[PDB]
Amino acid sequence: MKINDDIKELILEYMSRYFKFENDFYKLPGIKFTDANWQKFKNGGTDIEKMGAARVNAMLDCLFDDFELAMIGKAQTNYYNDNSLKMNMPFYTYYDMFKKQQLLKWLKNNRDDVIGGTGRMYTASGNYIANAYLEVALESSSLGSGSYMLQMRFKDYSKGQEPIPSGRQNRLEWIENNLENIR
Amino acid sequence: MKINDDIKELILEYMSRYFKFENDFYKLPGIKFTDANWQKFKNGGTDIEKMGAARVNAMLDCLFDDFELAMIGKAQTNYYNDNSLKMNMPFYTYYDMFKKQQLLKWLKNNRDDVIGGTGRMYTASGNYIANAYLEVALESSSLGSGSYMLQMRFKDYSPSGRQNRLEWIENNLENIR
């Protein structure tokens, strides 16, 4: 893992995916940007490398599962050592591809260990964004109390938007039928 | 995860495990402390929360595999929500326990997939500390070019072949942290 402009672009990309209103994110405890400093951050006026470590890691902690933070670091290693990848796509897009390949690996090795659920997002005003993402985990990686060592987040980007069913088998089949629609 | 004093204590603990001489670590590119500022950092004079994000994450990147960085964050969630854990032990100690329990899980449920090898550490003077740690990974998690999605590091405080090195790990569970 390396903090740089690719990570700033990744944060801003994922912030826009989960948060309809930017202030629901940038006013969060641990992040707490003023309206002016937020705009400065979005527009390239603030070097993420020199920003406070707690603030940068709080933005990452909000947007990504801890396992996704490991995937970001592993994706960076692949990206910075592959000239074809750097030539063709920005880092955040490569990360989505790395993450999708991890899900394909889970589905291939043991589809029956793949579980999921709807994820919500806490806002600065003390409310929640319903259906912010689809949370996917390997059941065997359970850490107890709804925690999992291997866990990921996806967003449904289809026009069709096939309703995500509640029920273990129906959800696994939904995932398998919407692989091209989730990012 | 969360950057706080528990992480500063964790960095200092792991730095002491892998680096015989402190300057081999704190003078590294991307970390680059002066002798005076390192002393200030070491004895609570520098707030890690306010330090540069790239510097803090470079210290973490050196000391931990990216999968271990995920384990730190998951361990923090368990630790901050369990009053018995906070009462009895500091965070870094709990993290070693969380990590050890992850290894036991791999040995129990993914035994035929457990691979290992010697890890080396790059120093500020441009050389390598050859047997810095035992590297343990799940072969099926391979990312190509010696990279693995699921990978951990252990320090031995006390062998050729896959099932053999596996038996060494199983016989030295109490000797590694």
Author numbering:
A (entry chain A): 1 to 183
B (entry chain B): 1 to 158, 165 to 183
Q: Which of the paper's sentences describe this entry?
A:
Expression of the putative acr on a plasmid in a CR1-immunized S. thermophilus strain completely abolished immunity against the CRISPR-sensitive virulent phage D5842 (green), and even eliminated the residual resistance observed against phage D1811 (red). This new Acr, which bears no similarity to any Acr characterized to date, was named AcrIIA6. All AcrIIA6 and AcrIIA5 orthologs completely restored the plaquing efficiency of phages targeted by the CR1 system of S. thermophilus, indicating they are blocking the activity of St1Cas9. AcrIIA6s did not impede SpCas9, while AcrIIA2 and AcrIIA4 exhibited only a partial inhibition.
With bioinformatic predictions yielding little information, we set about the biochemical characterization of AcrIIA6. It crystallized readily and its structure was solved at 1.96 Å revealing a dimeric assembly. Each monomer consists of eight α-helices and four β-strands forming a β-sheet, with the sequence topology α1α2α3α4α5α6α7β1β2β3β4α8. When the AcrIIA6 structure was submitted to the DALI server, only low scores of structural similarity were returned. Helix 3 exhibits strong electropositivity, a feature observed in dsDNA binding helices, including the one from C.Esp1396I. We mapped the sequence conservation among the 48 unique AcrIIA6 alleles to the structure obtained. For AcrIIA6, we chose an ortholog (92% ID) from the reference phage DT139 whose host, SMQ-301, also contains both CR1 and CR3 systems.
